[PDB]
Structures are given as C-alpha cells and as structure tokens.
Design an enzyme around this catalytic site. Structure first.
Site: not given
Ligand SMILES: Cc1cc2nc3c(=O)[nH]c(=O)nc-3n(C[C@H](O)[C@H](O)[C@H](O)COP(=O)(O)O)c2cc1C
Ligand SMILES: O=C(O)c1cc(=O)[nH]c(=O)[nH]1
Ligand SMILES: O=C(O)c1[nH]c(=O)[nH]c(=O)c1CCc1ccc(-c2ccccc2)cc1
Ligand SMILES: CCCCCCCCCC[N+](C)(C)[O-]
Ligand SMILES: CCCCCCCCCC[N+](C)(C)[O-]
Ligand SMILES: CCCCCCCCCC[N+](C)(C)[O-]
Ligand SMILES: CCCCCCCCCC[N+](C)(C)[O-]
Ligand SMILES: CCCCCCCCCC[N+](C)(C)[O-]
Ligand SMILES: CCCCCCCCCC[N+](C)(C)[O-]
Ligand SMILES: [Cl-]
Length: 367
Positions: A116, A120, A186, A188-189, A226, A255
């Site tokens: 992804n 944000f 993140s 992505n910022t 985080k 993350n």
């Molecule tokens: C589509 C998507 C969007 C995410 N957006 C955020 C976010 O807004 N803030 C954040 O701290 N982590 C974000 N993450 C990261 C997840 O919270 C998690 O740290 C990461 O995906 C690892 O866990 P997983 O393998 O179970 O997905 C996002 C992950 C995915 C897949």
């Molecule tokens: O908004 C996102 O792009 C996002 C935020 C974050 O903390 N981690 C991530 O994988 N995506």
C-alpha cells in the site's frame, strides 16, 4: 476445533470477492459491512488464559486490529464483534486529506502480501473526534470490560511543523483513547521516518508527552511509538534510549516494510509502498525481539506484521510482545481469521506449558 466458516471464507468467499473488486473497493465495502455488524458468527469465547493486563488496561484477548483498516473510526464496534480484544483506529491527520492517487493498494496473492501507498487518507481530527464522541460512553464501558481503544496519529502532507501536528492530535483525540500511537513509520509520507532519529524523536516525544500529561487524569492515554521494520541497529538503539529517558509507555513493532525480500512472486512486487503480510512476519518478529532486549523487557510491545495463525502470534509474544495485531491476514482469510488465531494461540499456550499469555511474554529471552 477448526471451522466451516474458516474454510468457506478462505476457499470461496474471499477469492470471489477479490475477483470482483479491486483491493481499495473491497476495503471500503468491508468497512461498511463491519460498521453495520454484518459478520459471520464469532463462536470463539475468550478464555481467561487469553487475558492480559498492560498499558493501564485489561485486554480480554491479545489479538487486535492494526491501524489502517478503520482509518477514520467508522467500524469500531463491528471490530469488537469480530472478536478483536482491542481496536486501533487511524492514522488520523489534523486536517482532512485525500492521500495519494488511485490505484494505491495492491495484492500479492502468491506471497500472502499487500503493498500500500495510501498516504494518510484521513477524514481529519474533527470528524473523527465527533464520531468517537458519539460513542464515548459505550467505549468507556467496553474498555472497562477489557476491550480497549487505541488511536493512531499521523501528520498532514503539507504541515510545516510535525511535532505540532502530533500535539494537536493528542489534544483532540487523546481524551477519547485508551492509548495513542505516534506513528513516525509510514513509508508513504515524505520525510516522516526521519522522525525516528534520535534528536527528532526526543524533541517530538517530549512535546507529545507534555501534551498528554496536561490532560485530565481520566482522559490521559498511554503513549506508544510505532516503528519501522527497516531501521538500522543504531536507530533501534537510539529509540530504546529515548523511550527509556522519556518514559514512553510502549512500542508498536512494526509498520510495513520498504524492503522487498528476496523471493516475492506477486506480479505487483515492485509497486512503491509498504509491504505487509507473510513476507514481513519474521522481520517483524526479529524487530520485536531486539526492542524487548534493548528495553530490558520493561517496555510493553504490541507486535504486528504477518500474523495469520496462533503460531505466528505466539512467536511474537515469546519474542517480547504483550499484545499482537493483524490486518493483512484479514484481507486473505476474512473475519474467521480472528477466532482461528485465538483458538490456535490458546491451544499452543496449553501445549507449551504456559498458564496463560502473560507467562509467555518474552519467554524466549529467558531460555
Ligand atoms: C492497507 C494498509 C493501510 C495501512 N495504514 C496504516 C496507518 O494508517 N497507520 C499505521 O500505523 N499503520 C498502517 N498500516 C500498517 C499496519 O498497521 C501494520 O503495521 C502492517 O500492515 C503489518 O501488519 P500485517 O502484516 O498484519 O498487515 C497499514 C497497512 C495496510 C495493509
Ligand atoms: O496511509 C498509509 O499509506 C500508511 C500508513 C502507515 O503508517 N503504514 C502504511 O503501510 N500505510
Ligand atoms: O481485499 C483487500 O485486498 C483488502 N485490502 C486492504 O488493503 N484492506 C482491506 O480491508 C481489504 C479487504 C478485507 C476484508 C475484510 C473484511 C471482510 C468482511 C467483513 C464483514 C463480513 C464479511 C467479510 C471482507 C474483506
Ligand atoms: C470443485 C471441487 C470442489 C472443491 C470445493 C472446496 C470444498 C469446500 C470448501 C470448504 N467449505 C466451503 C465447504 O467450507
Ligand atoms: C455475488 C456472488 C457472485 C458469484 C459469481 C462467481 C462464482 C465463482 C465461484 C468461485 N469459487 C470456486 C472460488 O468459489
Ligand atoms: C468477473 C471476473 C471473474 C471473477 C469471478 C469471481 C470468481 C473469481 C475466483 C478466482 N479464483 C478461481 C482464482 O478463485
Ligand atoms: C456491492 C458491490 C459488489 C458486491 C460484492 C459482494 C457483496 C455480497 C453481499 C452478501 N450478502 C449476503 C450480505 O448480501
Ligand atoms: C456480475 C459480474 C461482474 C463482473 C466483474 C468484473 C471483474 C472486475 C475486475 C476486478 N479485478 C479482477 C481486477 O480484480
Ligand atoms: C465485504 C464483503 C462481505 C460479503 C459477505 C457478507 C456476509 C455477511 C453474513 C451476515 N450474517 C449476519 C448473515 O452472518
Ligand atoms: Cl521486479
């Protein structure tokens, strides 16, 4: 046990949905369904062996929904219904913002992974605050009953003062949260992950903690940071040092990764963004292990990255996590994954001679 719904979702419903809808559309529909409580039955009943006390709270089970699924606090109650022991919403940014252009989420089915680059996308503090406020008493009861709420804070793309963005978040949402997350990881910022470096972090965290401490006691959340899975050994040392110096309450580890582990098969592997799911799992686990050691086991860790089974959860717990989260696994297996992980984890705790989760935390370190 081992369930019908688990198999049906895994083998038929989810593949069919992925076939019909691109990942962002599917996510939006899933948020809607969950928000309405339109879910398969969560038969699994949390046993006492799954309860954990940490971060000033009781958690009925240690399996939470990671940030990114309910960005804007629209599906909190549906998520509890799904069987998560705790819910984290966000990231939320001060002002509303759209995020990156579409497409910005990509499946790697062969890898049980997602990439992804949402950037944000956020309804902003005001909207979220109001949404949480509408259910604040119901949450207070849920939290008392061992179903806490976390709020993950981000920063806007065009902000000229990151620390102020986080401070604004603390002031606005902190009073509504059991815990807050300073998400400085993140991918992505632009520029965000530099906030993980020692001087920046110390400055940002001191401000954040001050703001927090200024809230009324009943409204004063725990603060966690985080972190990325992509840090150098120096970065990690520095973070541990700062967390200890300032008294940060906990860490969320990790993350998504900007790495692309060797062996990925998905056609979409070289898309820009953070990679989640199975290829991230051990990297995540190792990071937990390192952070637990750097903090002498005195700093609670919420472990996240590639959890889709009880074994995966336990591995993180034994590595030093007090709690775990998942997201990507949901995207593959659907809601039944939650009860699957919990049932498997309870079985393995019994099999390995742990009296409950708490006894397993950090166990590998004591071997
Ligand atoms: C589509 C998507 C969007 C995410 N957006 C955020 C976010 O807004 N803030 C954040 O701290 N982590 C974000 N993450 C990261 C997840 O919270 C998690 O740290 C990461 O995906 C690892 O866990 P997983 O393998 O179970 O997905 C996002 C992950 C995915 C897949
Ligand atoms: O908004 C996102 O792009 C996002 C935020 C974050 O903390 N981690 C991530 O994988 N995506
Ligand atoms: O489908 C995805 O790729 C996807 N990708 C994401 O990055 N985020 C997502 O959330 C998803 C969709 C996952 C999902 C979650 C819950 C359900 C669900 C919810 C309620 C009832 C039945 C299924 C279905 C699909
Ligand atoms: C086309 C041959 C049949 C294969 C279908 C898979 C068997 C059923 C899968 C699990 N179930 C959906 C019943 O729960
Ligand atoms: C709204 C439902 C429309 C379903 C149409 C597609 C059915 C294909 C079944 C595929 N599969 C064997 C994986 O279940
Ligand atoms: C409309 C395009 C075809 C999609 C129909 C829905 C079922 C897709 C399932 C794909 N697969 C067989 C791999 O599971
Ligand atoms: C809504 C746009 C695409 C449809 C995808 C799947 C919807 C399935 C509806 C299931 N349900 C039994 C609740 O009606
Ligand atoms: C009633 C059947 C509707 C046709 C759906 C067409 C498939 C959409 C494409 C989704 N995709 C395969 C790219 O994920
Ligand atoms: C987001 C895709 C959702 C598709 C399937 C929804 C199934 C809901 C089942 C509801 N019920 C309350 C009947 O279990
Ligand atoms: Cl390539």
């Amino acid at each position: 046990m081992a369930t019908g719904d688990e198999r049906f979702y895994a083998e038929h419903l989810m593949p069919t949905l992925q076939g019909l809808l691109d990942p962002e559309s599917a996510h939006r529909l899933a948020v809607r369904f969950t928000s309405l409580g339109l879910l398969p039955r969560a038969r699994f009943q949390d046993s006492d062996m799954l309860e954990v006390r940490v971060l000033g709270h009781k958690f009925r089970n240690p399996v939470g929904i990671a940030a990114g699924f309910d960005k804007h606090g629209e599906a909190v109650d549906g998520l509890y219904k799904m069987g998560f022991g705790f819910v984290e919403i966000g990231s939320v940014t001060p002002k509303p913002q759209e995020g990156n252009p579409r497409p910005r989420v990509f499946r790697l089915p062969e890898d049980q992974a997602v990439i992804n680059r949402y950037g944000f996308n956020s309804h902003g503090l005001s909207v979220v605050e109001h949404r949480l406020r509408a259910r604040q008493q119901k949450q207070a009861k849920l939290t008392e009953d061992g179903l806490p709420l976390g709020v993950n804070l981000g920063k806007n793309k065009t902000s000229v003062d990151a620390a102020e963005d986080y401070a604004e978040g603390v002031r606005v949402l902190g009073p509504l949260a059991d815990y807050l997350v300073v998400n400085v990881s993140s991918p992505n910022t632009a520029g965000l992950r530099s906030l993980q470096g020692k001087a920046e972090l110390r400055r940002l965290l001191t401000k954040v903690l001050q703001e927090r401490d200024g809230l009324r006691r009943v409204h004063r959340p725990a603060v966690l940071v985080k972190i990325a899975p992509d840090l150098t050994s120096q970065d990690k040392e520095d973070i541990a040092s700062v967390v200890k110096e300032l008294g940060i309450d906990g860490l969320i580890v990790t993350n998504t990764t900007v790495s692309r582990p060797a062996g990925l098969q998905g056609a979409l592997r070289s898309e820009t963004g953070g990679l989640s799911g199975k290829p991230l799992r051990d990297l995540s686990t190792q990071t937990i292990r390192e952070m637990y050691a750097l903090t002498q086991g005195r700093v609670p860790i919420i472990g996240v990255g590639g959890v889709s089974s009880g074994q995966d959860a336990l591995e993180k717990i034994r590595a030093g996590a007090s709690l775990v989260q998942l997201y990507t696994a949901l995207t593959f297996w659907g809601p039944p994954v939650v009860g699957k992980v919990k049932r498997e984890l309870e079985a393995l705790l019994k099999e390995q001679g742990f009296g409950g989760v708490t006894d397993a935390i950090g166990a590998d370190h004591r071997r």
